[model samples]
Target: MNPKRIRALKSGKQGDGPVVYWMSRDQRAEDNWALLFSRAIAKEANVPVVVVFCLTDEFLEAGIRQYEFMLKGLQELEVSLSRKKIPSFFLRGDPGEKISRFVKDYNAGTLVTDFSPLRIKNQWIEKVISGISIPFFEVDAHNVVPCWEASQKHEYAAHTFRPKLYALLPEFLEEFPELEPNSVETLSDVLETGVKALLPERALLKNKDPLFEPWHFEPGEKAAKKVMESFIADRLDSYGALRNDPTKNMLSNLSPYLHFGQISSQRVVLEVEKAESNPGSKKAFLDEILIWKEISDNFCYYNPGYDGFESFPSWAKESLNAHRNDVRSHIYTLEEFEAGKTHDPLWNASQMELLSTGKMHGYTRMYWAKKILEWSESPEKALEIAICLNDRYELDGRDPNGYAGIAWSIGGVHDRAWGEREVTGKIRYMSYEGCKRKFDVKLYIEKYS
Candidate 1:
């Protein structure tokens, strides 16, 4: 374990019997810095640790699909925590309010939480920080190098952040310390609520409302471990070259798990590093983690309005605004786009894939949003629809990646403007021909449609 990454302190108060690990970003029991930190504090104070998760209806881009995926993961998490004698609690309401109440009720002396850069998450943190009187600490378990620790200022693009991340990688990328139950369990008198049993079969169902049935994701540390092992055995070899292929399902379908905090990215990275012997694959996968995932935090940090219309750089905003009045040859209604009945078969197929599978290939996602820009009344409207639909249907919706990606496609955040086009103007353009050249479009359409 990297000592620099770990922050430790002895609690001043001696009366509290249990310390709370307010579960937010890092949901799993294993390879979790927040959970580990909570345990360490509990051991020092000779108190028990209890984990709590609060479910809310206020997620911006989240709907039933995202909820179901998360709920499923949480179900597994509940069981795994219980086995270790660590009681887990689920409360429904504003997270900040719920956590404050729970802390007071439990007489928790110290509060530990995971890191999140999104505005809504920050709002909750601010509320908790202000509302709670006890000592509170945040662990940066999400980013390899802690987000604030990486750079004080926001990065311009991946190019600028790449060297900085690489320089700090050795320090942050060290092996995660094993998390062992301290055998000291806190038995909360509070009753366990919500669904308790694992629902693996129900997790495979294709439905908009995942919670309507059992949670559709395999949650818990054991399930995540299995997933990691399976990915190593089957997908790690071809992940570099084939991850972009929409029809192939080649990329590790781990984003939902990661997003929901079912598993830590460190665990995934460590496991992948072990299985991967080829330096090219290792470099490629790590680049995705650093460039794609880390760049998202960089964008969110720099661009506070990352999820809003203002995220676009000045050049992109000016160019897109200039072409706002330009005539669109084929305009489609949001309803038509949502129903996957657009005139463009390619766009319809991509939409259908997201609707059916709750996910879209990473490459297709860019093409998917760009097409919305090309076909909508204006780029701004297109961005709104893309963001709405993505947040509503996709399991990993409302993430920094989703917002940054939409901005990149519609308003050019990290990307430079491409050659002039009819509807897109200086904005980057992606064509059906371009997608066809890259992947099997017909197969993609048949599978999703």
Candidate 2:
């Protein structure tokens, strides 16, 4: 494991008891640098290692669907951890407050957690740092290249970011080492009773939204690994040629798993590199999974205004505001959009896909958001509605990629000025005709309709 992967959030005296791995962003027991680091801390003192996840009832726009997927995955992870003598616990509350309290109660020697660029996670780390005296460590277990090492500043676009990433890939993209199990028992006596008592709250959290459920992607590390393997074997060869077609299922479909940190992006990339696939196809897939995906983290980490209009490039802001008053085709409220009741069948179909399956196709996602910009009263309002709908419904919502994608579509965050147009202005245009030329638009609309 690369020592550069670990960053000390706080350095101090080691506590007297077991090392606690406050598993937040990275949930899996396998291929987790944070977990391995926790085990290393415990090894020095010959203490047990335990995994902790603090469940919050209100995590951004997460609803019953996200909770259901996460809880199911956590259940599987608990079993996986136990087989290696690592105990796991689930507590409910504001993670920062609850996790600090757990550290005190358990007399934890050291705290280890995986990294996330999201503001909420950073706030949690801040609170924990203030509350504890033990050493705190964060491992960039999520990215193939550590976000910090990838670049010190937020990148302008993929072209600017790609060179930095590819340069570091050889040094940072080595195979993940397996975590050795704890030598000491992690509360062998009361582990079962205590963990079982708290897990029922997952059901309660999941009951918040009775109407919606995740129907598309399977959750958990096992399911995530299987999905990766199948994609490599079946679709990696044709991904470059067919990935843009809305009707074709040629995508890797790894976003939900990657967003939840169930599987390491490095692991997926490593596997893809070894597979016998078309060089063009492999390059395209790697471009997405590597540059496009990782750059979102870099964006969020550096730009505090990631979720709002403030993050938009100045050129985009000028162009959009100049054209702000030029819209006149159709207007839809958030409620109307959520219901997929727009006049445009193609846009409605994209919204319907998100509602029914907790996912929307990649190509249509661009068109869907661009249409939202065209239909809404203002660019700001359009972004708000888009973020609200995306975070509420999609399994992979509330992620940096979602934010970056939405910003790119609506505000041209990573995009350059294209042929100037009505409403969209310099933001690249994606019209109904544009989509029709790319894929079977009628087939997509009919399938979702």
Candidate 3:
């Protein structure tokens, strides 16, 4: 991993010391371009390298459920890095303040960090760049193609972006190098405290949502690889056919891992492409990861209001505003939606599945969000309800994909206007009957209800 994956934050001179990679967005030690860049730089400079992670107690819309998943994966990350003779440390509070102080205090010569499209993360990066004297670089470890490099501006939808992405694929999609063990001395302070000192105290669940806990999925990098392997062996052959069927167990089940950066999307893409299964299934899966998935991040990267109603296209905004006062026959409160007390059993089952399984089937997830629009008092409220419920309960909440998906579902961020409807304006819609036509809806409701 050379500097191709890396970009300068703010070019400047450096003090003399170890190279520090302030790990964020991309969490795993393996198949991480950011980590590889840091190691490569440290080797060239012939100095020590350390991985620093900043842990904030509270984040907007991030409650206990998200933290619970992260802590388990991070604990596993430390053990993974330690076995390779690399030193990793954890600090509490804002990344901007804590990480900057750590760099200056350690006399760190260079700084490297991962990328995220979220505003909070961008603010942190800005503060770090301004505060530190050392040179800083950012690497797009999350996507196979860097988000910034994907396109200079926000893409209208897959149609416009797909052509551009396909044009660059031959050059950007490349092989990865193995992360090998290397011996290095830790700081004198770290040596006295030891690896055990680096570990944080045991964390308990902080999310207050009654339905937040999920047992169906495991968290961490090791589990991520196994999960991918299992999908390839048993499910890839039918992914194109069964992916849309909520009644089947053939869904990829990889989003939580992908969202948390516990696994590399690039790794999954590489492995799946080589699998000798159904060509159509492989193409469908690849199309999602290679283009559709990356486009979500691209949307958030360019559109600061990716979470707001303003992210909607001009046509969407105009139409939704026109139908803002459209009478809703069945409006539900946030609390009612939370408890799965909706009038529609199929919709309730979709919500219940997300609550119980930490995820909803991809096809049902779209149905689940669109129904919120039809039932809510207004389009804006529907978006609010959809985002809140998703960010609070789903394991993969608070991600670019989550925001983009919901926006697409309710706000028409990516979708075009459909036949004019009631409360949904001209936004593309999904109905309970439509779902029934597509899947074994009765069986799904029976299983979840």
Candidate 4:
């Protein structure tokens, strides 16, 4: 770790009072920079540190599946934190408001938090920063290369961001430091164990929404580590080659864990590098970790209107706007799309997979979103439906990757214009026939549908 890069904000005097580590992005006991940093500060001040997480009912693009996966993880996290002598508190409300209330009640001086690049997350952070009078510090624990340090502008493509990340990789990719529990013995004995009583009732609710139910995901650090270990042992070697194959199920299914901060991306990157002894596998995994993740963060930072229509580059936006009136040969309503009743069985299957499993292969996701652009009444409406459905159901919804993927499909954010098409116009177009040529459409449909 670069000691200089770890910046600290000065609040008032450090004391034995509680130091709050507001759990947002990184929600694990081990390999968490935010939590480690908080412990370092708390030890110096002789204070008991409390980890607080807010459970809001109104998370955008999130529904029952996302909720169920996250709540399960939280249940496990509560148990683990108890063993570590740190009290974990769960509050139900808007995050910004809840953090403010916790600070007041606990008389917390300095607040430590993990980093997020999404517009919604930043909005919440801004609200919290504005509401609080104490010093607030955020650690960039997600990206292998910190987003702000990588670049100041929106990168045009992955190629542009790749070099910047490469330049910093050697320095930033070091193994994580081991976190030692504070020396304050018996701190756990004195703290109240009210996480169970304070736990929100909704955490126990089973996500029974017919559109998205039957997924087996548990939340918290231990489950995330288990999934990572399993993937490294059984699937990661062939990940680069077979990741695009929807029927193979070869991709890492760790996005939900990453999204809810159940596992840190840093830990994933470190473990993958160690597991893949072969140079090819290591290179491939690194590309996914650094190149793709950096692009996602760059999209969120550079394109302030990332989640909205204005995120498209000027030429792409102009081309899409110009073809706004183009009539679609087969228009499907949002309801039809959600129900997976489209003309293309392949596309319908992909949608069904997301609806049923809270996930889809990455390559299939591109094809899935692009097809929505082709069949919807308008490009704008297509973007809305695709983003809404993705955010509402996917365990990893409302991420920078989600925004980047949606914009890439509908308005060609990182991609150049391709041959002219119906509603897609100069924007890149992908078809069911193209997808069929690449993978087994029949088997995919049967498995998912």
TM-scores of all candidate predictions against the true structure: 0.88, 0.92, 0.92, 0.89
lDDT of 2 by residue, 203-238 (tens): 221346433445568889999999999999898888
Winner on TM-score between 1 and 3 is 3
Each candidate structure's count of clashing pairs:
1, 0, 1, 5
From the highest TM-score down, the ranking of the candidates is 2, 3, 4, 1
Local distance difference test, per candidate? 0.74, 0.84, 0.81, 0.75
| After superposition, candidate 1 runs with Cα above 4 Å error | 1-15, 59-62, 183-220
Poorly placed runs, candidate 4 (over 4 Å):
3-16, 59-61, 184-216, 276-278
Give the better candidate number (1 or 3) by lDDT: 3
lDDT of 4 at 151: 85
> Per-residue alpha-carbon lDDT of model 4 for 346-431, expressed as tens digits?
78888878877788778889888888887877767887898888887787887888888788888888878788765677977776
What is candidate 2's TM-score against the reference?
0.92
Q: lDDT per residue, candidate 3, 222-314, as tens digits?
A: 888998999999999999988899899787788889888899888887888777999898888878887789999998999999888888999
Which candidate do you rate higher for TM-score, 1 or 4?
Answer: 4
